[PDB]
Design a protein around this motif. Sequence first.
Motif, PDB file in Angstrom:
ATOM      1  N   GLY A 159       0.677  -1.146  -0.243  1.00  0.00           N
ATOM      2  CA  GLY A 159       0.091   0.259   0.086  1.00  0.00           C
ATOM      3  C   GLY A 159       0.714   1.211  -0.093  1.00  0.00           C
ATOM      4  N   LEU A 160       0.630   1.815  -1.109  1.00  0.00           N
ATOM      5  CA  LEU A 160       1.375   3.498  -1.275  1.00  0.00           C
ATOM      6  C   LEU A 160       0.926   4.835  -1.065  1.00  0.00           C
ATOM      7  N   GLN A 161       1.647   5.389   0.153  1.00  0.00           N
ATOM      8  CA  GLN A 161       1.490   6.577   0.801  1.00  0.00           C
ATOM      9  C   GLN A 161       2.201   7.578   0.552  1.00  0.00           C
ATOM     10  N   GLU A 162       2.050   8.812   0.604  1.00  0.00           N
ATOM     11  CA  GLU A 162       2.690   9.773   0.340  1.00  0.00           C
ATOM     12  C   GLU A 162       2.933  11.345   0.817  1.00  0.00           C
ATOM     13  N   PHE A 163       4.753  11.020   1.544  1.00  0.00           N
ATOM     14  CA  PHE A 163       4.719  12.682   2.191  1.00  0.00           C
ATOM     15  C   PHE A 163       5.336  13.500   1.852  1.00  0.00           C
ATOM     16  N   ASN A 164       4.821  14.877   1.902  1.00  0.00           N
ATOM     17  CA  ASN A 164       5.331  16.472   1.530  1.00  0.00           C
ATOM     18  C   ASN A 164       5.327  17.063   2.224  1.00  0.00           C
ATOM     19  N   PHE A 165       7.042  17.316   1.850  1.00  0.00           N
ATOM     20  CA  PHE A 165       7.461  18.163   3.225  1.00  0.00           C
ATOM     21  C   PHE A 165       8.030  19.279   2.575  1.00  0.00           C
ATOM     22  N   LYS A 167      19.586  24.182   1.132  1.00  0.00           N
ATOM     23  CA  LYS A 167      19.296  22.994   1.367  1.00  0.00           C
ATOM     24  C   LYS A 167      19.630  21.623   1.026  1.00  0.00           C
ATOM     25  N   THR A 168      18.932  22.166  -0.846  1.00  0.00           N
ATOM     26  CA  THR A 168      18.443  20.778  -1.402  1.00  0.00           C
ATOM     27  C   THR A 168      19.724  20.376  -1.635  1.00  0.00           C
ATOM     28  N   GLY A 169      21.110  20.798  -2.040  1.00  0.00           N
ATOM     29  CA  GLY A 169      21.980  20.059  -2.284  1.00  0.00           C
ATOM     30  C   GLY A 169      22.258  18.813  -1.044  1.00  0.00           C
ATOM     31  N   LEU A 170      22.276  18.841   0.142  1.00  0.00           N
ATOM     32  CA  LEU A 170      22.875  18.724   1.038  1.00  0.00           C
ATOM     33  C   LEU A 170      21.807  16.913   1.372  1.00  0.00           C
ATOM     34  N   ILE A 171      20.716  17.548   0.450  1.00  0.00           N
ATOM     35  CA  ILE A 171      19.449  16.142   0.531  1.00  0.00           C
ATOM     36  C   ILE A 171      19.699  15.272  -1.413  1.00  0.00           C
ATOM     37  N   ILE A 172      20.458  16.410  -2.549  1.00  0.00           N
ATOM     38  CA  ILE A 172      20.943  16.011  -3.711  1.00  0.00           C
ATOM     39  C   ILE A 172      22.509  15.133  -3.554  1.00  0.00           C
ATOM     40  N   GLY A 173      23.498  15.682  -2.027  1.00  0.00           N
ATOM     41  CA  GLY A 173      24.331  16.046  -2.898  1.00  0.00           C
ATOM     42  C   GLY A 173      25.039  16.454  -4.199  1.00  0.00           C
ATOM     43  N   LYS A 174      27.051  15.967  -3.568  1.00  0.00           N
ATOM     44  CA  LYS A 174      27.503  16.196  -5.031  1.00  0.00           C
ATOM     45  C   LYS A 174      27.555  14.886  -6.008  1.00  0.00           C
ATOM     46  N   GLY A 175      26.644  15.481  -7.320  1.00  0.00           N
ATOM     47  CA  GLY A 175      26.774  13.782  -7.876  1.00  0.00           C
ATOM     48  C   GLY A 175      25.094  14.005  -8.241  1.00  0.00           C
ATOM     49  N   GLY A 176      24.228  14.077  -7.262  1.00  0.00           N
ATOM     50  CA  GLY A 176      23.338  13.024  -7.122  1.00  0.00           C
ATOM     51  C   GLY A 176      23.519  11.501  -6.215  1.00  0.00           C
ATOM     52  N   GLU A 177      24.436  11.628  -6.130  1.00  0.00           N
ATOM     53  CA  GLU A 177      24.967  10.420  -5.173  1.00  0.00           C
ATOM     54  C   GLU A 177      23.685   9.783  -3.725  1.00  0.00           C
ATOM     55  N   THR A 178      23.451  11.439  -2.947  1.00  0.00           N
ATOM     56  CA  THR A 178      22.245  11.279  -1.781  1.00  0.00           C
ATOM     57  C   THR A 178      21.553  10.887  -2.016  1.00  0.00           C
ATOM     58  N   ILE A 179      20.499  11.364  -2.234  1.00  0.00           N
ATOM     59  CA  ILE A 179      19.205  11.376  -3.130  1.00  0.00           C
ATOM     60  C   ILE A 179      19.183   9.466  -3.521  1.00  0.00           C
ATOM     61  N   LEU A 229      11.914  16.012  -6.395  1.00  0.00           N
ATOM     62  CA  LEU A 229      10.986  17.176  -5.664  1.00  0.00           C
ATOM     63  C   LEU A 229      10.253  17.698  -7.267  1.00  0.00           C
ATOM     64  N   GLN A 230       9.956  18.381  -6.918  1.00  0.00           N
ATOM     65  CA  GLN A 230       8.190  19.375  -7.232  1.00  0.00           C
ATOM     66  C   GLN A 230       9.195  20.356  -8.774  1.00  0.00           C
ATOM     67  N   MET A 272      12.163  28.172  -0.674  1.00  0.00           N
ATOM     68  CA  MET A 272      11.177  26.650  -0.402  1.00  0.00           C
ATOM     69  C   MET A 272      11.144  26.084  -1.545  1.00  0.00           C
ATOM     70  N   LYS A 273      11.478  24.869  -1.100  1.00  0.00           N
ATOM     71  CA  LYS A 273      11.460  23.870  -2.601  1.00  0.00           C
ATOM     72  C   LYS A 273      10.724  22.772  -1.885  1.00  0.00           C
ATOM     73  N   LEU A 274       9.786  22.105  -2.419  1.00  0.00           N
ATOM     74  CA  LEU A 274       8.668  20.617  -1.927  1.00  0.00           C
ATOM     75  C   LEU A 274       9.419  19.655  -2.536  1.00  0.00           C
ATOM     76  N   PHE A 275       9.182  18.782  -1.682  1.00  0.00           N
ATOM     77  CA  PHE A 275      10.063  16.883  -2.049  1.00  0.00           C
ATOM     78  C   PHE A 275       9.286  15.957  -1.760  1.00  0.00           C
ATOM     79  N   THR A 276       8.338  15.069  -2.025  1.00  0.00           N
ATOM     80  CA  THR A 276       7.644  14.268  -1.811  1.00  0.00           C
ATOM     81  C   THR A 276       8.139  12.804  -1.874  1.00  0.00           C
ATOM     82  N   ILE A 277       8.249  12.520  -0.254  1.00  0.00           N
ATOM     83  CA  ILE A 277       8.627  11.049  -0.147  1.00  0.00           C
ATOM     84  C   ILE A 277       7.387  10.234  -0.790  1.00  0.00           C
TER      85      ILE A 277
END
Length: 80
Positions: free
Chosen positions: A1-7, A13-25, A38-39, A50-55
């Motif tokens: 069962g798939l659900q969504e969390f928006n934050f 701070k988007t870099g800290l989630i993406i990572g140099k290279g996109g390695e972290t995300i 990423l929206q 502000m940047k919206l993300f959805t998990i």
Amino acid sequence: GLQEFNFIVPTGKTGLIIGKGGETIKSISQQSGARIELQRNPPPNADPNMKLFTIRGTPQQIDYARQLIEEKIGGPVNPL
């Protein structure tokens, strides 16, 4: 069962989630089993500071991905 969390985080701070290279995300998506979106085209009433993300996943996957993101940014995400 798939659900969504928006934050949001500050745009800077988007870099800290993406990572140099996109390695972290990619690494958080692989370890958690969840997708991290990423929206792409924010509506005109969206804050440009502000940047919206959805998990997307099972709740268990979403909870794990959120904890890994919070280690990287050094505190809690802002939930919508």
